Amino acid sequence: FSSRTPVNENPDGVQYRRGFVTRHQVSGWRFVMRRIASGVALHDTRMLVDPLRTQSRAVLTGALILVTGLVGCFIFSLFRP
Amino acid sequence: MSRLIFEHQRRLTPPTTRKGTITIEPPPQLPRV
């Protein structure tokens, strides 16, 4: 339900400096960064499909396959005689 | 001064301009996560 943040009308109140980074903020930053990257490498900003994110995901999936096979053969060496 | 007579006719129309306001949709309302 409630989501708001009215304007503070008190001059003697508290002002919240030194903000952190929210999950929302970091997601928005990652999005705008992927959008700039798309607009630079390609000439798309409509972002209907992002092949760059797919490529990065592909390389990281390769890395995950790597580390998974590694730990798998490791525990295989240990458990088996 | 005055040594020749110029005749006044319809001005050539300026390129079209418009006053019609341009509304913009309000941004999304910050979904959850």
Spatial CA neighbour of A50 closest among A40, A65, A35: A35
3-state secondary structure of A75: helix
**Residue corresponding to tokens 């929210």:** A22
> What is the Cα A26 distance to its own chain's centre?
7
Q: How far is CA A54 from CA A34, A46, A50, A58, in A?
A: 11, 16, 7, 6
Question: Which residues, 6 or more positions from A51, have their beta carbon under 8 angstroms from its beta carbon?
Answer: A42
Hey, are the CB atoms on B30 and A3 less than 8 Å from each other?
Answer: yes
A-to-B residue pairs, Cβ atoms closer than 8 angstroms:
6
Hey, are the CB atoms on B30 and A24 less than 8 Å from each other?
Answer: yes
Resolution in A: 3.7
